[PDB]
Design a binder for this molecule. Structure first.
Ligand code: ZN
Ligand code: ZN
Lengths: 97, 126, 107, 215, 96, 217
């Protein structure tokens, strides 16, 4: 059997390093008007505006490429004891495939 | 009857104590199942508190020798155009090729870091 | 309810009497004739039409009593019982599902 | 049907309203218990005293506790507990001592089943804090079996009435711990000056050991 | 056990940010640099939020500016028009 | 003599063999091990966290597997003994999935706004002789303002056992069976729904088989 520490080591989410400026492919799984909801793996999904150039091959199931500025997007504010999460990661949609 | 005091103890403790007293005449459906297979921690209410002085979280941080040489790799040679997939298991990145072949150089046996980096760099170029 | 059942029986027997009362021993005595007959029998003179006399069937007279949502074992019938608004939430669920499968297909 | 309800405090409580003025609302506090350990207190607030009584006793039977008793006559140890600003110091007492406690504590412990306890309350004698702190301590008792299981050792009793005979009261239900209990010479415990004053006999009071009625 | 994580100092650690003058020598006679950190119209010394300087460098810039202005190297009320062409570094946008 | 059909699974450890239903590989590929950032941590979920990976928490999948085994065995025994299992969450993303899972099985779901007093003022709210659920599964403990749930507190008040998926920002304090795992990702939520549905289904056909056997003998 393979231990969870070995699993975590030979997991791609750990071999990625920090999410910043890492090119990751993902799928579109939900659309609202022009707000594409893309998964890139990991815990959360990202939301990206539909690019107006070539804006019709961005449908449910499309493979896109993402830059992944952030992985969870949390921040603590002035009076808070825990931080305010938005349950969503940050990424920039660069194209298809 | 029952006791709606969620904070004094657990539901198991309150129910066992009431049926021992003789107030809750019929045992609830969950009592014998709990008595057969209790969880690892008794669900007793606890007030969360702030750590104030010299108290730190015992949660450690995850790091590796592979993470060191990944640091050096992403330092000198940027994240390549070969994008990460991150969905399929056993996905091996270009940096993953770098670390595994750095590792085979390490175990074949040698001394110095800069020269490690150079023969693995020419080996990637090959 | 047994109240509704014996009230329906009483209404049937009463409208039979009432048609025989006025002129209408034939079985077909319609509701507007019932209203006309009771209007003649008891001359209303009350400004409120709900304060006027009425002869309707107990379905229209009595309000809609909702059926028992659970049997003789607990175990309520609808899966959305514990919301307390089972019909509205089931409707919301059904419309949302119809939107979902429509999207995956495409007064 | 085996549950007895006793009122403890009835207060005439006013609030101010825009039109009427002073609005009298009766707030009552009751304790409900059967003489087997189960007891609970509650507050009932209404405009009528009978409505307040009914609300209070029904909410208490929905908010019951359970109180462990040593031999169904007294508590397991001495309990020192401060609830907000009410310090209650209670001591287990042997049989026949009677309920030498505050009158509210006497009623509550008669509803519980306790018979032989000493109890001195100090700070603010507030009725609603008294009952709540008493129930906190009596529900946070530690019993002999729990002590034996926690320490892994035998729990024994040595009475002056019987003599040097050791009476095992609680044994561990699992393994027996073999290294003995560390004899800490000159133990670091927080004593009470009233207890030390009474033990040494400089507690000169004309009120302490007065001849009162039963319990 | 060979795959359990181990304790080290944080890799992927970016080096700490350095101010533009960090490691540089600020002198009161360097009225081109001091003029850079002085406002063009009213001669006001800028703050940390405008200059982007660390605390020590902001203190040296302030002291050198006041010293040069009282010793007769810098105008007080305005920036030198001869030095109103230097590389702008201060994050201030007056025009629109 | 029905205490055999109400007592033999109580002495058979894992009477429903639910340990075959999940593995650490399966939980990991469902991304159960992921958690929130270190500032979203809870003092009481601290013992369940394996570590922090780049300020993102990782949940111990061994503890997850043990707690999941215990919770699955408990809900299987309750569904065998014909309790009422109420599924509660406030995602608005997996609400449809949870209600559809309940309807695929035969248990109940509350995925909408929990109005004041469902479980507590239940007799005046529903009817004088309603049976409250004998088990509640919270798939997501937090409500939509990230606070622990009113039905968690109220099930503790009403002495109803609670099986709950706890994330790193959750309070596992008043949940009888906490399963430390990720509940923010579709794969993890799908695996939780699948496991609980299969366990409840498998408990109910085992119950009908056992009562059929007792009726034949
Ligand atoms: Zn500097
Ligand atoms: Zn979460």
């Amino acid at each position: 059997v393979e231990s969870f520490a070995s699993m975590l080591r030979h997991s791609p989410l750990t071999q990625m390093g920090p999410a910043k400026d890492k090119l990751v492919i993902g799928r579109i799984f939900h659309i609202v008007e022009n707000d594409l909801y893309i998964d890139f793996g990991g815990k959360f999904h990202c939301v990206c505006r539909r690019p107006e150039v070539d804006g019709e091959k961005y449908q449910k199931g499309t493979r896109v490429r993402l830059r992944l500025l952030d992985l969870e997007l949390t921040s603590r504010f002035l009076g808070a004891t825990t931080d305010t999460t938005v349950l969503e990661a940050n990424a920039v949609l660069l194209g298809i495939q | 009857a029952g006791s709606r005091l969620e904070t004094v103890g657990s539901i198991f403790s309150r129910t066992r104590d009431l049926v021992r007293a003789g107030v809750l005449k019929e045992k609830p459906l969950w009592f014998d199942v709990y008595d057969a297979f209790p969880p690892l921690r008794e669900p007793v209410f606890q007030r969360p508190r702030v750590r104030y002085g010299k108290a730190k979280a015992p949660i450690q941080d995850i790091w590796y020798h592979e993470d060191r040489i990944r640091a050096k790799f992403y330092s000198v040679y940027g994240s390549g155009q070969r994008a990460f997939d991150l969905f399929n298991p056993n996905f091996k990145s270009t940096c993953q090729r770098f670390v595994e072949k750095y590792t085979e150089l390490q175990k074949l046996g040698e001394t110095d870091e800069e020269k490690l980096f150079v023969e693995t760099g020419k080996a990637l170029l090959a | 309810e047994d109240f509704i059942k014996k009230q329906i029986e009483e209404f049937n027997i009463g409208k039979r009497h009432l048609a025989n009362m006025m002129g209408e021993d034939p079985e077909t005595f319609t509701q507007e004739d019932i209203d006309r007959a009771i209007a003649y029998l008891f001359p209303s003179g009350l400004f409120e039409k709900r304060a006027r006399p009425v002869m309707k069937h107990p379905e229209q007279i009595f309000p809609r009593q909702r059926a028992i949502q659970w049997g003789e074992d607990g175990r309520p019938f609808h899966y959305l019982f514990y919301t307390g608004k089972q019909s509205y939430y089931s409707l919301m669920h059904d419309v949302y599902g119809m939107l979902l499968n429509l999207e995956k297909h495409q007064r | 049907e085996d549950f007895d309800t006793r009122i403890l405090e009835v207060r005439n409580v006013f609030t101010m309203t825009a039109k009427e003025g002073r609005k009298k609302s009766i707030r009552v506090l009751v304790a409900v218990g059967n003489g087997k350990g189960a007891a609970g207190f509650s507050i009932g607030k209404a405009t009528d005293r009978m409505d307040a009584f009914r609300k209070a006793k029904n909410r208490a039977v929905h908010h019951l506790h359970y109180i462990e008793r040593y031999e169904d006559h007294t508590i397991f140890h001495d309990i020192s507990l401060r609830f907000k600003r009410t310090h209650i110091k209670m001591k287990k007492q042997p049989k026949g001592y009677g309920l030498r406690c505050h009158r509210a504590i006497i009623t509550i412990c008669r509803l519980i089943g306790i018979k032989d306890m000493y109890a001195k309350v100090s700070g603010s004698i507030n009725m609603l804090s008294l009952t709540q702190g008493l129930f906190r301590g009596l529900s946070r008792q530690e019993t002999h079996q729990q002590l034996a299981d926690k320490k892994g050792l035998h729990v024994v009793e040595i009475r002056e009435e019987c003599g040097p005979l050791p009476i095992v009261v609680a044994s561990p239900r699992g393994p027996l711990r073999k290294d003995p209990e560390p004899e800490d010479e000159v133990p670091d415990v927080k004593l009470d000056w009233e207890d030390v004053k009474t033990a040494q006999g400089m507690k000169r009071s004309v009120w302490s050991n007065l001849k009162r009625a039963a319990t | 056990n060979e795959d359990l994580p181990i304790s080290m100092e944080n890799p992927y650690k970016e080096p700490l940010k350095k101010c533009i003058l960090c490691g540089k020598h600020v002198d009161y006679k360097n009225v081109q640099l001091l003029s850079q950190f002085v406002s063009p119209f009213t001669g006001c010394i800028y703050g940390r939020h405008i200059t982007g300087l660390c605390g020590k460098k902001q203190k040296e810039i302030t002291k050198a500016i006041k010293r040069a202005q009282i010793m007769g190297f810098m105008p007080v009320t305005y920036k030198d028009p001869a030095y109103l062409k230097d590389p702008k570094v201060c994050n201030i946008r007056y025009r629109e | 003599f029905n205490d055999k059909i109400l007592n033999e699974p109580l002495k058979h450890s894992d009477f429903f063999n639910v340990k075959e239903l999940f593995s650490v590989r399966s939980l990991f590929d469902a991304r159960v091990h992921l958690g929130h950032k270190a500032g979203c941590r809870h003092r009481f979920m601290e013992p369940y966290i394996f570590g922090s990976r780049l300020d993102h928490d990782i949940i111990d999948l061994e503890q997850t597997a043990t707690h999941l085994q215990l919770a699955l065995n408990f809900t299987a025994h309750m569904a065998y003994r014909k309790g009422i299992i109420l599924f509660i969450s406030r995602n608005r993303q997996f609400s449809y999935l949870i209600e559809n899972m309940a309807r695929d099985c035969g248990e109940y779901a509350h995925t909408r706004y929990f109005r004041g007093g469902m479980l507590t003022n239940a007799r005046l709210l529903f009817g004088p002789t309603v049976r409250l659920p004998d088990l509640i599964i919270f798939l997501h403990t937090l409500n939509n303002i990230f606070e622990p749930h009113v039905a968690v507190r109220d099930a503790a008040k009403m002495n109803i056992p609670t099986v709950g998926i706890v994330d790193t920002n959750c309070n596992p304090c008043l949940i009888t069976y906490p399963v430390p795992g990720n509940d923010d990702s579709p794969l993890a939520v799908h695996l939780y729904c699948r496991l609980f549905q299969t366990a409840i289904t498998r408990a109910k056909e085992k119950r009908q088989q056992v009562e059929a056997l007792y009726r034949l003998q």
